[PDB]
Amino acid sequence: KDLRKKSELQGTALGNLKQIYYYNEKAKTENKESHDQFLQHTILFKGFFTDHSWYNDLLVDFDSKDIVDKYKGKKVDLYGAYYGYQCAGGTPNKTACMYGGVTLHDNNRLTEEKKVPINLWLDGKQNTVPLETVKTNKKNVTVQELDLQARRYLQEKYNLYNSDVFDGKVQRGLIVFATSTEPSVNYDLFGAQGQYSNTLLRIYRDNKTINSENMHIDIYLYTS
Numbered sequence: 001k002d003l004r005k006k007s008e009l010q011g012t013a014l015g016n017l018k019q020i021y022y023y024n025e026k027a028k029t030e031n032k033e034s035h036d037q038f039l040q041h042t043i044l045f046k047g048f049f050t051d052h053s054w055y056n057d058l059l060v061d062f063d064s065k066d067i068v069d070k071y072k073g074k075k076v077d078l079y080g081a082y083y084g085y086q087c088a089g090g091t092p093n094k095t096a097c098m099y100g101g102v103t104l105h106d107n108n109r110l111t112e113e114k115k116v117p118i119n120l121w122l123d124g125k126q127n128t129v130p131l132e133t134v135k136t137n138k139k140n141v142t143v144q145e146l147d148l149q150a151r152r153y154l155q156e157k158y159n160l161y162n163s164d165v166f167d168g169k170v171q172r173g174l175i176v177f178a179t180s181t182e183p184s185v186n187y188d189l190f191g192a193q194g195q196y197s198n199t200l201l202r203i204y205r206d207n208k209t210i211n212s213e214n215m216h217i218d219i220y221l222y223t224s
């Protein structure tokens with residue numbers, strides 16, 4: 001183990017994790033481009049939202065200027081969670097923020113949707129997870145795209161981020177994105193930093209991307 005316990009999470013942090021992974025809508029677009037920037041580790045997509053009530057622009061945060069350079073001016077696809085609190089950079093009051101979630105558009109379409117096999121163990125006992133739970137059309141997919149989908153299932157099925165009072169029985173948990181061609185990426189399900197979206201989502205700022213072709217996800221949940 002030696003993972004964070006949900007009881008170590010404070011007041012609003014648990015509620016906001018449920019907000020992010022269960023209630024909020026996700027930014028999901030194909031074929032966008034921009035060379036606009038706010039700070040040098042960001043890329044500003046002016047007019048990203050066309051139907052949104054409150055928002056207009058999307059400011060994407062990356063780990064460094066080096067990562068920005070790989071996407072700036074190129075045609076890209078986006079899939080990620082965004083927040084409006086403590087966000088600014090474009091149109092005043094109508095700017096939404098996101099960490100990573102950007103992949104190159106050209107030659108990344110798979111002929112058919114790839115269904116990512118999920119292996120799940122609740123207190124050692126294996127549980128069957130439907131194959132259409134986590135899926136993608138990208139050859140190189142951000143871990144964020146996959147994580148958002150997996151955690152929603154965990155919410156629906158296990159009330160992952162509900163307080164104990166509300167049948168939230170899982171206390172510790174881990175998600176592992178196992179690829180055959182590189183080392184695993186694994187997140188502690190209760191290891192987010194802070195209480196708000198602006199800090200809880202920083203885990204995706206590295207824009208970690210993985211080959212979806214022949215990989216799987218392992219999820220280990222514990223009720224104590």
Ligand SMILES: [Zn+2]
Nearest residue numbers: 178216217218
């Ligand atoms: Zn595995």
